[PDB]
Paper text:
Therefore, we decided to disrupt the capacity for a steric zipper by strand H by substituting residues Thr119 and Val121 with the bulky residues tyrosine and tryptophan. The size of these side chains is expected to prevent formation of tightly packed steric zippers formed from amino acids with short side chains such as Thr119 and Val121. Aggregation assays of TTR variants showed that the mutants T119W, T119Y, V121W, and V121Y did not produce aggregates after 4 days of incubation. The side chain organization in this peptide also explains why the residue replacements T119W, T119Y, V121W, and V121Y impede TTR aggregation. Because residues Thr119 and Val121 are pointing to the hydrophobic T4-binding site, we cannot dismiss the possibility that the tryptophan or tyrosine could strengthen the hydrophobic contacts to increase the stability of the protein and delay aggregation. However, the involvement of these segments in the formation of TTR fibrils was supported by two pieces of evidence. First, peptides with Tyr/Trp substitutions did not form fibrils in isolation. Second, the aggregation inhibitors targeting these segments hindered TTR aggregation. For additional evidence, we synthesized and analyzed 6-residue peptides containing the same substitutions, and they did not form aggregates or fibrils in isolation. These experiments suggest that strand H plays a role during TTR aggregation by acting as a fibril-forming segment.
Numbering used by the authors:
A (entry chain B), B (entry chain A), C (entry chain A), D (entry chain B): 10 to 124
Write the structure that this text describes.
């Protein structure tokens, strides 16, 4: 599991469950190609998006569908989604955790990268 | 100006100066059209991006070039840039401040919407 | 004023108004002595807490009464308050801005120190 | 394990290892009584601070020794420590994760509370 996504809810103090996550990889023609997608679990985590074989060097975009999450809770939030864009595996394979802590008008996002 | 961008540096405890900022508006064909751009001032602020006349309801993207900022400081960053995507809605008079607090492997972003 | 406090609300996307703020300075006996206090304005800012003469090097604590703020909004909070503890150091001319971005179960706090 | 502390480093994109953490509980005389302490592991986590029996209702303070952490990395940080003050177990036993994401001039802290 070289790529994991974790989402937390700062209003409730809980994992953000059933959040849609779409991952894209930048192609040679400079366009965003769909790479993987899924929904966060009861722990606010999304595992099994990819494999070490498939997750080659490149520029990746993780789109976290925060608006649909807040709308289902009765909040009209500010952002359409939280977008995380980064170069992966350029010095060899790494394990990446992309995390976001969500509020209606804000989000904090960070990465934990391990060898 | 109805749209202001503010960028802060959490490593130095200072405004993030000379940061490139690009604003886009989503077109009918679903593509991102360049809308406005600039560089943050000595106060980490970017004023005068648009006018009330030009800034109509729509979906906007604010791209903050964080990678170039960290590279100029000799600090290895994670993100290619920080992206803020939101709908501008005419619910009475409004001013939008899009802010970001930057760290090499994280950023927090928020919006202050006032009348 | 060499010390300003700014508080923002991440649920509403607005300044956090009428928030009580208490500043303390650590005394020789290791206890926290009241130093200054006030309430944030309509811009979420608290100015005029001290003067350059009074604000000597020392360890200071800024306590932001977040619980009372959330309770007045009918939102169940986690923290009793947000506490910022720091040393003020005379390394040339300095102005300190202590800022906090509040959510019910989280807060981000940062400092902008300028000349 | 009803109380766990997790600390992350936003400069390195890694767990914050060997961070000292002190927990206090407010006593009847309004003073902070030492309750538990420890150091974060290689995963940036501190488990086994207390037991369900010992962790009774009360006001608790978790002091995360961020200054010593940054000083050991060659950074002179802004804060003396990150302080998290909260009421625990007032509606019955809960499991609490207190987390902090650290930068030299900023920190974000949140709680994940589960039943």
């Amino acid at each position: 599991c070289p790529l994991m996504v974790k989402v937390l809810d700062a209003v409730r103090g809980s994992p953000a469950i059933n959040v849609a996550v779409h991952v894209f990889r930048k192609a040679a023609d400079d366009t965003w190609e769909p790479f993987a997608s899924g929904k966060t679990s009861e722990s606010g985590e999304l595992h099994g998006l990819t494999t070490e074989e498939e997750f080659v060097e490149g520029i990746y975009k993780v789109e976290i569908d925060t608006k649909s999450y807040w709308k289902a809770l009765g909040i009209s939030p500010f952002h359409e989604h939280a977008e995380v864009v980064f170069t992966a595996n350029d010095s060899g394979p790494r394990r990446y955790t992309i995390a976001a802590l969500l509020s209606p008008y804000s989000y904090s996002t960070w990465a934990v990268v391990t060898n």
